[PDB]
């Protein structure tokens, strides 16, 4: 079996973009901060800890638009007890057609890899957006790299990436551009 079911019909003809969570769209920590966009309770061995989450700038603009252009899929090496609530709060527009977490990654050479082969899509019509090149080692030609984000409220990288994505959204074969 594959990780995703068939694309639902309005998505059939779209490129499938796999999008990472931490350091890509948000940055989270257990260290209290005052300006967290979200605070999430996470239970670890019977103790409830608080996770403070900051939104990367332009994340809302970015997701709303990607959600129109692609079949967007959340794929993260983090556990659902963290990632799933954050996606609930982050994803106002329903951009994410599916969510995959740590158990859907492949553990390989000490790293949790996003094995794009396991989605069940044509890789000529798959992209991955992930801040950590280790996450896509099996498919480095499917990637749009993006810098790691932590707290720079000046970051404009998700904004500045939209034009590139618009123009990818049109093509038949993503490799025709990334090679």
């Amino acid at each position: 079996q594959y990780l995703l079911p068939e694309a639902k019909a309005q998505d059939s003809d779209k490129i499938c973009v796999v999008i990472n969570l931490d350091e890509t769209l948000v940055h989270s920590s257990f260290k209290p901060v005052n300006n967290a966009d979200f605070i999430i309770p996470v239970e670890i061995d019977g103790v409830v800890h608080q996770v403070y989450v900051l939104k990367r700038p332009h994340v809302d603009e970015f997701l709303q638009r990607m959600g129109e252009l692609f079949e967007c899929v959340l794929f993260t090496a983090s556990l659902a007890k963290y990632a799933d609530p954050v996606a609930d709060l982050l994803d106002k527009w329903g951009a994410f057609r599916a969510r995959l977490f740590r158990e859907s990654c492949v553990f390989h050479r000490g790293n949790y890899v996003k094995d794009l082969s396991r989605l069940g899509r044509d890789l000529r019509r798959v992209l991955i957006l992930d801040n950590s090149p280790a996450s896509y080692v099996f498919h480095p030609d499917n990637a749009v790299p993006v810098a790691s984000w932590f707290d720079n409220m000046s970051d404009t990288e998700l904004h500045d990436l939209l034009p590139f994505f618009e123009q990818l959204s049109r093509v038949d074969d993503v490799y025709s551009v990334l090679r």
Binding site: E23, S28, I44, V51, A77, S78, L79, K81, Y82
Partner: peptide, 4 residues
């Protein structure tokens, strides 16, 4: 860590 439950994150990354």
């Amino acid at each position: 860590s439950p994150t990354x």
